[PDB]
Amino acid sequence: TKETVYISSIALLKMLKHGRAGVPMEVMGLMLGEFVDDYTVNVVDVFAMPQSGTGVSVEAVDDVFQAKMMDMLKQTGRDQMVVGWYHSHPGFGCWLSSVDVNTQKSFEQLNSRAVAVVVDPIQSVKGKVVIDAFRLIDTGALINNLLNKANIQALIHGLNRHYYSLNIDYHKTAKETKMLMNLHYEEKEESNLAATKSMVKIAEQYSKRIEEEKELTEEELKTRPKKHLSETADETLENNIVSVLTA
Amino acid sequence: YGLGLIYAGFGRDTTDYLKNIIVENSGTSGDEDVDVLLHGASLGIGLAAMGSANIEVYEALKEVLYNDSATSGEAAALGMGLCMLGTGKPEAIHDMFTYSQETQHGNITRGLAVGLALINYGRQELADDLITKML
Amino acid sequence: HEKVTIAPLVLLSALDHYERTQTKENKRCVGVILGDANSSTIRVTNSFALPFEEDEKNSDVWFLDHNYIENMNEMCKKINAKEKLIGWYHSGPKLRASDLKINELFKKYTQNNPLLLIVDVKQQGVGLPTDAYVAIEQEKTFLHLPCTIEAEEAEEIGVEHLLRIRLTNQLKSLKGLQSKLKDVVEYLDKVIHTILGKLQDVFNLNNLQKALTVKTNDELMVIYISNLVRSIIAFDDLIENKIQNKKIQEQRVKD
């Protein structure tokens, strides 16, 4: 078939950490892990390449760097083989830079299952990360797998390679999942402190709901709005439940 | 695959006939041409042997899982569930249940999920132990 | 001073690392952290696994390299300058005799004092995973340091994509007191101030909230009256719904 890309907590985060700091005017780099294909591909980990003054092309994969990093990872259990390469780039829906494809193509003579993934930090500051993964097409795989497909059949006998979008998924263990949600001790002890200081500030918070209500009643008059008032009523109920709980 | 469709409800001959194809093509997995052959092979045998429970078929489809072929493992997994329908071993449930967890190919994992549902057909309260275990 | 901020990558690496190197109970996993720590806020911004082994003859006899430390910080520098090593890592089994004794060796190639992060990175414990300690001798003397998290703008948005009361705190409180009593009994037995003294008289008088109740009550009427206006408001909205139903029925009868 074709790939579905499971990115690990530490892999996703490393992709964002490196990409942001390496800015457009790019840094480049390698993805590590492995899979057994046809429905399971895992990206365990990632590391950064060290900025080179020829933008983010095949010339920017420092082979001594990668070799030394792979060996040192190995001695701490974390080394695996390249499952693709990632980076940071201007962001495109047809391929993030020209350089990433031209790098990808050299890789593609060796591999036959290597992806290019890039996250673009320009569009990842609307509070929703914009991240893409694309790979080029291969013959004898993406026609053997997914009238039949006339379109994709003339496309593959034609170009031989062209961009296609790969899915974004995540995989993480239960151990991570449990022990995030006791950080996000600070939360429990912080919760006591917050209750105490809230009762202190209540003098002002009192007065504004008094105002909110005066607007509210006036509004309903003018109409004769209703929706706001109901939302406006619900909110006030929630706040009192909280005020009572404090004390 | 098409022979297994027909000869369900009187697979007596066809199960044996298909079994000889299962044992044969377990070596061959080097080409997606063989994975598609062994994939029908597994569907058919599961379908033909339905409603009785022949352990002989179960043990054959299971070595296709150990060889870990990506298409064929989906058909075999679902196939053990079809074959043993409503007449399974308690042992068969336990062995199947552990193996879902073991398998790291998505398709084999998908096929053993559905596989586990089939094998408890008609049990009623007697399945209650397995419902919990899956959830 | 101290005020320690800790990368979620640190916690998640330590987790994954312990299983992936097949480290059992009764073997330690030891690590390094680096970042920026010459500041009032200690910034932990990365970390790395360290090769660690312990012997059959005594398990406080152990091997840590320093060369994997010599040249790895000078690869940390090369992606992000300012991510040299100040200290160290532990997953447990925790608070051993030679968990003091990595300190004198880690003093050989640190630039201040080894910061000791023990973290329960199997995530098996209840509450905090972070058993942070400033590594001071005098023996495993071990003053704890309270603080986890603070991370990057990009990481926190990514964190949320991965993931998508009075009683719980009181139960914790009960367990500490209960533990404290048990310790005090043990401590007298072995042997044959002020903090405890503020933890009894102060709370003797929901307990504290009693004294406050006088002031609370006055405002408590007021905020109650506010909820009553809201109830009236719900009734008003309700009446419209009754009419809507009433209209429909009326039209159906004409027709």
Swiss-Prot record, chain A:
Residues 5-140 form the MPN domain. SMART domains: JAB_MPN. GO terms for cellular component: cytosol; mitochondrion; nucleus; proteasome complex; proteasome regulatory particle, lid subcomplex; proteasome storage granule. GO terms for molecular function: cysteine-type deubiquitinase activity; metal ion binding; metal-dependent deubiquitinase activity; metallopeptidase activity; proteasome binding. Its EC number is 3.4.19.12. N-acetylated by NAT3. Zn(2+) binds at H87, H89, D100. GO terms for biological process: mitochondrial fission; peroxisome fission; proteasome assembly; proteasome storage granule assembly; proteasome-mediated ubiquitin-dependent protein catabolic process; protein deubiquitination. It comes from the Eukaryota. Pfam families: JAB, RPN11_C. It catalyses: Thiol-dependent hydrolysis of ester, thioester, amide, peptide and isopeptide bonds formed by the C-terminal Gly of ubiquitin (a 76-residue protein attached to proteins as an intracellular targeting signal). InterPro entries: JAMM/MPN+_dom, JAMM_MPN+_peptidase_M67A, MPN, RPN11_C. It is an enzyme of class 3 (hydrolase). A motif (JAMM motif) lies at residues 87-100. Gene3D superfamilies: Cytidine Deaminase, domain 2. Keywords: Acetylation, Hydrolase, Metal-binding, Metalloprotease, Protease, Proteasome, Thiol protease, Ubl conjugation pathway, Zinc. Component of the lid subcomplex of the 19S proteasome regulatory particle complex (also named PA700 complex). The 26S proteasome consists of a 20S proteasome core and two 19S regulatory subunits. Interacts directly with RPN8 and STS1. Belongs to the peptidase M67A family. Present with 16400 molecules/cell in log phase SD medium. Component of the lid subcomplex of the 26S proteasome, a multiprotein complex involved in the ATP-dependent degradation of ubiquitinated proteins. RPN11 is the only catalytically active member of the lid and serves as the essential deubiquitinase of the proteasome. The JAMM motif is required for the deubiquitination and degradation of ubiquitinated substrates. The gene is RPN11.
From Swiss-Prot, chain B:
N-acetylated by NAT1. It comes from the Eukaryota. PC repeats lie at residues 1-35, 40-74, 75-109, 111-135. Acts as a regulatory subunit of the 26S proteasome which is involved in the ATP-dependent degradation of ubiquitinated proteins. Belongs to the proteasome subunit S1 family. Present with 4750 molecules/cell in log phase SD medium. Interacts with UBR1. This is 26S proteasome regulatory subunit RPN2. It comes from Saccharomyces cerevisiae (strain ATCC 204508 / S288c) (Baker's yeast). The gene is RPN2. The chain holds residues 406 to 540 of 945 of the full protein.
UniProtKB/Swiss-Prot annotation, chain C:
Disulfide bonds: none annotated. N-acetylated by NAT1. GO terms for cellular component: proteasome complex; proteasome regulatory particle, lid subcomplex; proteasome storage granule. GO terms for molecular function: metallopeptidase activity. Residues 4-138 form the MPN domain. GO terms for biological process: proteasome-mediated ubiquitin-dependent protein catabolic process; ubiquitin-dependent protein catabolic process. Keywords: Acetylation, Phosphoprotein, Proteasome. It holds the Pfam family JAB. It comes from the Eukaryota. Belongs to the peptidase M67A family. Acts as a regulatory subunit of the 26S proteasome which is involved in the ATP-dependent degradation of ubiquitinated proteins. Present with 19800 molecules/cell in log phase SD medium. This is 26S proteasome regulatory subunit RPN8. It comes from Saccharomyces cerevisiae (strain ATCC 204508 / S288c). The lineage of its organism: Eukaryota, Fungi, Dikarya, Ascomycota, Saccharomycotina.
